[PDB]
Ligand binder design. Structure first.
Ligand SMILES: CCCCCCCCCCCCCCCC(=O)O
Ligand SMILES: CCCCCCCCCCCCCCCC(=O)O
Ligand SMILES: CCCCCCCCCCCCCCCC(=O)O
Ligand SMILES: CCCCCCCCCCCCCCCC(=O)O
Ligand SMILES: CCCCCCCCCCCCCCCC(=O)O
Ligand SMILES: CCCCCCCCCCCCCCCC(=O)O
Length: 581
């Protein structure tokens, strides 16, 4: 490979190349119009083709990093539009590159993207499909500059699948909107999982991250030995350390070099990898990250022998504290894919601290004899929360379960703004739906993945706009305890009930005409303010109020003369409730 741009053109193919160069350029030049990018992207593709034809052609032996930067600096309004960024063009090539990385804006000043109508979309996607998908690719890329480029492309292909199906059906929107709903949420949850790996590698260090990865990998590849699991985690840490630094090309070669290792050492790792390992370069590492947990060797002993019973437990511990603890995590993790990673790290930390104490008594073996009884209540604490919430979710539907939850977290942190308590509680609802539809031995990992998502969003909405000490505690706490901390918030008895307001509890005929979506946000915003008004309110009482409201709204949506009902009855509701309390 004399020429890096030719080689890489051949292994992606023309179509994937153009789109990734679009995304790559969209992510730096976040203010130049869509049409400039089509010009850059055409020019660069013309140029790659040169190097496919003849690898000794002009400039083809320049590396990708030299090419990318040369191209940004040919931009005319770069001084005018980008300011500081134009100063990077005046340096040498081992500094120019890392200067462009430092001057990437995160979350610019762009207007938020309004999703157009189902018929305008289907028409546009019909009329010109490539300029419809790339403009929207360019649109989402410029707004999310730290979103890893080929996953953005992976999400783009799913967007394309959605339209190709549901625009070719005679009632388009009933098909289409529930698909675009999923993608919005999957894609934004992708953006925030990416956000979480980099913050925690920084915040919590490289040892925590490795503990987390040994755990996940051993649940994924229970038939691999500790040596190979150790060797996988070592190169991931390097990969994610290298990816979080932000240089796309450097990140992508790191992920490609591990994927290619995983597929050549496939018999040493897992039997579930054949399908992913026959994938084209671009899809490979994505596929490997998503592949399902292999089955654990059937003839597996107790952990008691190596980690409790044996002599040479403290001797093996002291010889290499972290190696010993990583063997524990591994062995415990590979017997329990039913656990969340976090609970496994709670158990590894529990074993850790007993040894610190017990290996430095005059008698260790009797001190830690009982260490496994200390796993009992840590195991059961997330199981009983999943038992309890999901049994509840089985009684009330999703919607009433979101309202069950809304009263719950409004009484614990009433100082939060009403729109936040709504977004978080409806969000939690959907993690109710999905995860309580799984079997017991597969629930705890579901909820872990979705809560970490919902709880990280929560915990920057909060560092932006703080409110409660207690919620600041959970957010600046260990990712290990972040969730139990939140589960341990009790009702706020320091809360002073807020001043009554009618406008809050006034309702106009517009409730009948809104969609179930926004019907529900309205009813729930009022539910929050209702509990904010009278926080010390019982849930026999609260059921009664909700009951009268249900009858009230239907009464006025099921009567001739709609608005006069709403004012007439609504006055009767507010006062009735104000005394029913
Ligand atoms: C990423 C590629 C998106 C292509 C579809 C654009 C139309 C959808 C508008 C934005 C949205 O709601 O996702
Ligand atoms: C000079 C041409 C412009 C630069 C080319 C665009 C850079 C985009 C890099 C995308 C790497 C995709 C490879 C997949 C690796 C993986 O995730 O396994
Ligand atoms: C390859 C070995 C990797 C790491 C092995 C050490 C296992 C650590 C077990 C305790 C969990 C540590 C969790 C981090 C939070 C903290 O304690 O500060
Ligand atoms: C599951 C029901 C979904 C309702 C919202 C989230 C409830 C969370 C309770 C279970 C906690 C999940 C385990 C996480 C951990 O091990 O720290
Ligand atoms: C801006 C910060 C707002 C804070 C609002 C707090 C809302 C609480 C959400 C808790 C989610 C974690 C799940 C806990 C499970 C449980 O209830 O046991
Ligand atoms: C001061 C007291 C004000 C009393 C006004 C009544 C507010 C009730 C708002 C919550 C309505 C619950 C509807 C949920 C449903 O049943 O779908």
């Amino acid at each position: 490979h004399k020429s890096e741009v030719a080689h890489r053109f051949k292994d992606l193919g023309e179509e994937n190349f153009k789109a990734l160069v679009l995304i790559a350029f969209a992510q730096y030049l976040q203010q130049c119009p869509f049409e400039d990018h089509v010009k850059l992207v055409n020019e660069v593709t013309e140029f790659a083709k040169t190097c496919v034809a003849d690898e000794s052609a002009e400039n083809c032996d320049k590396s990708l990093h030299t090419l990318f930067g040369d191209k940004l600096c040919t931009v005319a309004t770069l001084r005018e539009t980008y300011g500081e960024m134009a100063d990077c063009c005046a340096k040498q090539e081992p500094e120019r590159n890392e200067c462009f990385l430092q001057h990437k804006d995160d979350n610019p000043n762009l207007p938020r993207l309004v999703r157009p109508e189902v018929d305008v979309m289907c028409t546009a996607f019909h009329d010109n499909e490539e300029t419809f998908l790339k403009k929207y690719l360019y649109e989402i890329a410029r707004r999310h500059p730290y979103f890893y480029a080929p996953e953005l492309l992976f999400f783009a292909k799913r967007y394309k699948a959605a339209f190709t199906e549901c625009c070719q059906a005679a009632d388009k929107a009933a098909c289409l909107l529930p698909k675009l709903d999923e993608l919005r949420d999957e894609g934004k949850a992708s953006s925030a999982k990416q956000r979480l790996k980099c913050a925690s590698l920084q915040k919590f260090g490289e040892r925590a991250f490795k503990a987390w990865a040994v755990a996940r990998l051993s649940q994924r590849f229970p038939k691999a030995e500790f040596a190979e699991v150790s060797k996988l985690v070592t190169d991931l840490t390097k990969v994610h350390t290298e990816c979080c630094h932000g240089d796309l090309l450097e990140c992508a070669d790191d992920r490609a070099d591990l994927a290619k290792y995983i597929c050549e050492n496939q018999d040493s790792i897992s039997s579930k990898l054949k399908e992913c390992c026959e994938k084209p370069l671009l899809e490979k590492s994505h596929c490997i990250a998503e592949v399902e947990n292999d089955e654990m060797p059937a003839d597996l002993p107790s952990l008691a022998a190596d980690f409790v019973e044996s002599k040479d437990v403290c001797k093996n511990y002291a010889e290499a504290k972290d190696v010993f603890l990583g063997m524990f995590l591994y062995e415990y993790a590979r017997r329990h894919p039913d656990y969340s990673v976090v609970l496994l790290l709670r158990l590894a930390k529990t074993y850790e601290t007993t040894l610190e104490k017990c290996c430095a008594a005059a008698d260790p073996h009797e001190c830690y004899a009982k260490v496994f009884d200390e796993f009992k209540p840590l195991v059961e604490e997330p199981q009983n929360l999943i038992k309890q919430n999901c049994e509840l979710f089985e009684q009330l539907g999703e919607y009433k379960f979101q309202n069950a939850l809304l009263v719950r977290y409004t009484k614990k942190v009433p100082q939060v703004s009403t729109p936040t308590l709504v977004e978080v509680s409806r969000n939690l609802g959907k993690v109710g739906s999905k995860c309580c539809k799984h079997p017991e031995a597969k629930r705890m990992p579901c909820a872990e993945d979705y809560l970490s998502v919902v709880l990280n969003q929560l915990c920057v909405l909060h560092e932006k706009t703080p409110v409660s000490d207690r919620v600041t505690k959970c957010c600046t706490e260990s990712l290990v305890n972040r969730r139990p901390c939140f589960s341990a918030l009790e009702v706020d008895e320091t809360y002073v009930p807020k001043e009554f307001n009618a406008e809050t509890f006034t309702f106009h005929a517009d409730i009948c005409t809104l969609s179930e979506k926004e019907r529900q946000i309205k009813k729930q915003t009022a539910l929050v303010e209702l509990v904010k008004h009278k926080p010390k309110a019982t849930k026999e009482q609260l059921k009664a109020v909700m009951d009268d409201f249900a009858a009230f709204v239907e009464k006025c949506c099921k009567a001739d003369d709609k608005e006069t009902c709403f004012a007439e009855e609504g006055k009767k509701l507010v006062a009735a409730s104000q005394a029913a309390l």
